[PDB]
RNA sequence: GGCUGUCGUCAGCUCGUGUUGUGAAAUGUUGGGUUAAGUCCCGCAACGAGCGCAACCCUUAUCCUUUGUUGCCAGCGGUCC
RNA sequence: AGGGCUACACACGUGCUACAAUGGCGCAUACAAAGAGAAGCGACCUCGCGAGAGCAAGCGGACCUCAUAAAGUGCGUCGUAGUCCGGAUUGGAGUCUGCAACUCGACUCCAUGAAGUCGGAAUCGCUAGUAAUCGUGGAUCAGAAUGCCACGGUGAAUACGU
RNA sequence: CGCGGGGUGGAGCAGCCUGGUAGCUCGUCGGGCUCAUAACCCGAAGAUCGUCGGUUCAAAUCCGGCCCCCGCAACCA
RNA sequence: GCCCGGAUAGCUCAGUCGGUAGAGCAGGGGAUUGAAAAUCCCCGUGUCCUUGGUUCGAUUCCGAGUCCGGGCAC
RNA sequence: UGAGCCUUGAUGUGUAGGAUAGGUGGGAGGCUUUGAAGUGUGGACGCCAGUCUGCAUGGAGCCGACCUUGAAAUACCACC
């Protein structure tokens, strides 16, 4: 008779707030939530999405990678989110949209994305 | 190219049942300019089937092109490189006339007794949802889900927009600046 | 950016280009690419070609009035 | 020589005269808007014009008019209908 | 005068007819335009399986004749089997035009009856009375038309967008 | 001297272990795209397995002889 | 000659506490591009090795033997 | 903090079934300061609303026993 609700064995940690961080670039972008203190509590990405090619670039995929990371911290019973946001692909504030709408209150949009002061060389890729 | 939009010569009505849809089915149904006969092996199908269930003979007829109806399709915007493809709305009229398409093209293709067996069994299977153009449209919306869109000229389309003073702001689209 | 200090919750108007320090559109040039060190002459130094579109555009008013282009 | 195919039914191609350039040459024939069109309007050191586009031409689409057989038959008469 | 261009190992362009059931076969039945015709077209008549025959009216072109419009409509029939599909081939008999149809004609009929199950790479024509498809006429022409030239029947997909 | 390996469609290679089986990449020829060649695409053709014999129902294959190509060996006082 | 441990989609593995035949890649067709490289799609196949046995039924759960792979033997 | 040995407590969601089917014998029921039950509050809780149940409250029955369904039937004590 029995076909089943539940969605996975019961919560483990419980930590009610975390931090993610959205890190977004011109081949892949990788969500990773975090305690305040610094610890990660799961991760999803475009690639391991299912997107591969053209797609993994994309704001669509970008999304879809929010949406599956919220399910993996679930377990955690987290409700509040701060938000680091992190390099210049597009999926950038797409992937932002995608955790509102997932029912999270997002506490600030930090891009903190990494900038030299003239710093180290950079590659000269594409050259003539 | 192209300077004119214009098109869409009207049809006439059916003339059994006074309906524009059949009429527009006839006309997909028919080869070689014989309206006449397409006529009669529309009706002889369209009659196997609201026998075999439809209290009304339009009923199943109509659920018929529901269940095939494809909702969006994927066109082409060359980016080179290998495209892939985008999807767009299906226009309700160019929804109709896939939908419509498919079931004669599956028909046409049956290859039992008469186009009229053969029809009244490609609208009797996609009716109840395991027909030839059944799965065509399932085939369609597979190509369609799984490329959920992306474009191009992004760059220029943002550009060419500031170039006629246009927003700062881009999406995916399709034959055209996004 | 969206911006962070603008009041936290989240409300979906703010257009991210006009909420830029200066974040990409610049920031990013820097990556894949050295600016060779005096490229710059013939990528920059076209500050002149920008400052005379804006001459232009101030001239051609002018002469459409005295010629009347409408 | 005649003639014809083709780029192409693409819509362009150029003369006089005036002017600017040492000169080849440009100008007009470029600009603004519009069109099937160098189409038309506006506006300028260019002013005028010719070939070309359009037009006339035939044909078809109505309707009037006149004709009225070897065509036609609504009424009409006769009727083998 | 006879031969030749009309050969054949093969390769290619163009078109026809087909591979079928929206059909092929049979029988009954419907409504066109446009043209050609006194070197010609030729009814009615009786004869021939038929192509054709002979006998013979008529026509100068809205009149007579080529000329039975076909697909379509009706009904029956066949059952996915290279077949009641396809008809290429070849035998045999036969007709006509013309001096003569062997090389090098067209057509009738009996019989027979191949490849062909929608075609690799490639690829072309079209925007609406169009394409597709069905028949009809004509120029040349004693005799050879799938071609070319024209006429009318039935009559579509779709064109968002550059 | 001697010993062991080799002799395949026009080229280079595979299959060679008591066996019946011909494969790959080039090149070739026909068709296609292109103004035309190149390339690119599709189709096809090409070896009676060096040669002679023997064993075998059957041999490129196993066995024997000869020619041809390669590797090693042909000393010791 | 023992103890081990494996024997399935073509392959490796595996949903397979007995009530219940899969993931990854392999070949065909469709859908697109300077055919392709490369997206996305729908089929891919097994009496789980041959035999015993528990049982309400069980391949696997308990057992005997063939072949592969790993030890100690001699 | 692994493991063994071992002391007490426990889950087994098939197909049909009200639900409860770890293998299997006993067995017609167990009544300290009751054994109530039952609605309610939380916890564990997984082939999802299905078991056990701290305990507020209540001192006013679980439930088999041929009560029924099913190869096996349940309560309740052993066995592992």
């Given at each position: 008779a029995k076909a089943p609700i539940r969605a996975r064995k019961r919560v483990r940690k419980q930590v009610s707030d975390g931090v993610a961080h959205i890190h977004a670039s011109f081949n892949n972008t990788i969500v990773t939530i975090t305690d305040r203190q610094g610890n990660a509590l799961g991760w999803a990405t475009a690639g391991g999405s299912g997107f591969r090619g053209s797609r993994k670039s994309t704001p669509f995929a970008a999304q879809v990678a929010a949406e599956r990371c919220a399910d993996a911290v679930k377990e955690y019973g987290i409700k509040n989110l701060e938000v680091m946001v992190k390099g210049p692909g597009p999926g950038r504030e797409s992937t932002i949209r995608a955790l509102n709408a997932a029912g999270f209150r997002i506490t600030n949009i930090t891009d903190v994305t990494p900038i030299p002061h003239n710093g180290c060389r950079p590659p000269k890729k594409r050259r003539v | 190219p192209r300077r004119r939009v214009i098109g869409q010569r009207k049809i006439l009505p059916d003339?059994?049942?006074?309906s524009e849809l059949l009429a527009k089915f006839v006309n997909i149904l028919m080869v070689d300019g014989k309206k006449s006969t397409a006529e009669s092996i529309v009706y002889s199908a369209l009659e196997t089937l609201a026998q075999r269930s439809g209290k009304s003979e339009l009923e199943a007829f109509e659920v018929a092109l529901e269940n095939v109806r494809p909702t969006v399709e994927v066109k082409s915007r060359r980016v080179g490189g290998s495209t892939y493809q985008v999807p767009v709305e299906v226009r309700p009229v160019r929804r109709n006339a896939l939908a419509m398409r498919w079931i004669v093209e599956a028909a046409r293709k049956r290859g039992d007794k008469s186009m009229a067996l053969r029809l009244a069994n490609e609208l009797s299977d996609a009716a109840e949802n395991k027909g030839t153009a059944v799965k065509k449209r399932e085939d369609v919306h597979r190509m369609a889900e799984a490329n959920k869109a992306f474009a191009h000229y992004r760059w220029l389309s943002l550009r060419s927009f500031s170039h006629q003073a246009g927003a700062s702001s881009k999406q995916p689209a399709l034959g055209y600046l996004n | 950016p969206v911006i962070k200090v603008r009041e936290n919750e989240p409300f979906d108007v703010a257009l991210r280009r006009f909420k830029r320090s200066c974040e990409k559109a610049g920031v990013l040039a820097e990556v894949r690419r050295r600016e060779f060190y005096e490229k710059p002459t013939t990528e920059r130094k076209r500050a002149k070609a920008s400052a005379v579109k804006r001459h232009a555009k101030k001239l051609a008013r002018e002469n459409a009035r005295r010629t009347r282009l409408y």
């Open positions: - | 003339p059994k049942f006074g | -």
